[PDB]
């Protein structure tokens, strides 16, 4: 990994979304199934209306003792913390540290195109290459 290189080389497309009516319990299962620590919430027009992590689920559900059937809409954050595809790795890491986050949405020309997580960092630290061409 190179702290100078654009975040777009270490980011992933593996970004899952759920509808606002999706229950915390279902969102939790989906997260464990696909191994992701966060989820974006999309409205019926296909746009991001929210975002939330596993941590949000612990702090906004488990602690207050709220039902596991409540819609994630009730615990999601309604603004996103992002980084541009061209923002170099180092600066992205610094931003995640300052904001205390484990996941950061990637933006390009206004739209969310991917996400960078601590798992991705681990992947980069291990020098694992994503191949765009066929392997046999």
Distance between alpha carbon 14 and the CA centroid of its chain, in Å?
A: 9
Decide: is 34 part of the binding site for its own copies (CB under 8 A): no
Interstrand relation of 111-117 and 17-18 (parallel, antiparallel or unpaired):
unpaired
* Options 15, 40, 83, 93; binder of its own copies; rule CB under 8 A: 93
* Options 4, 44, 46, 63; binder of its own copies; rule CB under 8 A: 63
Nearest-CA neighbor of 16 among 3, 29, 1, 2?
29
Decide: is 88 part of the binding site for its own copies (CB under 8 A): no
Options 8-16, 43-51, 71-79, 113-121: segment touching its own copies (CB under 8 A): 113-121
Nearest-CA neighbor of 71 among 37, 104, 28, 115?
28
Decide: is 55 part of the binding site for its own copies (CB under 8 A): yes
Options 4-12, 41-49, 53-61, 77-85: segment touching its own copies (CB under 8 A): 53-61
- Region of 13 on the Ramachandran plot (φ > 0 left; ψ -120 to 50 alpha; else beta): alpha
* Options 62, 80, 86, 108; binder of its own copies; rule CB under 8 A: 62
Which ranges in 8-88 belong to alpha helices (H)?
A: 24-33, 54-57
Tell me how far apart the alpha carbons of residues 86 and 51 are, in angstroms, rounded to a whole number.
22
Q: Of the two residues 78 and 94, which places its CB atom closer to its own copies in the complex?
A: 94
* Least CB distance to its own copies at residue 83 (A): 14
The helix (run of H) or strand (run of E) holding residue 93 is helix 89-99
* Binding footprint of its own copies on the chain (CB under 8 A): 1, 3, 24-25, 28-29, 31-32, 37, 54-55, 57-59, 61-63, 65, 68-69, 90, 93-94, 96-97, 102, 118-119, 121-123, 125-126
């Amino acid at each position: 990994m190179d702290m100078k290189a654009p975040i777009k080389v270490y980011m992933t497309k593996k970004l899952l979304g759920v509808k606002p009516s999706t229950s915390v319990q279902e969102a939790s299962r989906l997260m464990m199934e696909f191994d992701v620590g966060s989820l974006v919430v999309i409205n019926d027009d296909g746009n991001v209306v929210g975002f939330f992590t596993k941590s949000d689920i612990i702090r906004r559900v488990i602690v207050p003792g709220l039902p596991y059937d409540i819609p994630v809409e009730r615990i999601m954050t309604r603004n996103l913390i992002t980084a541009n595809v061209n923002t170099p790795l180092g600066e992205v890491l610094r931003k995640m540290a300052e904001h205390r986050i484990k996941h950061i949405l990637i933006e390009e020309e206004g739209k969310i195109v991917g996400i960078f997580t601590l798992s991705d960092l681990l992947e980069a630290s291990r020098r694992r290459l994503e191949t765009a061409i066929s392997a046999e």
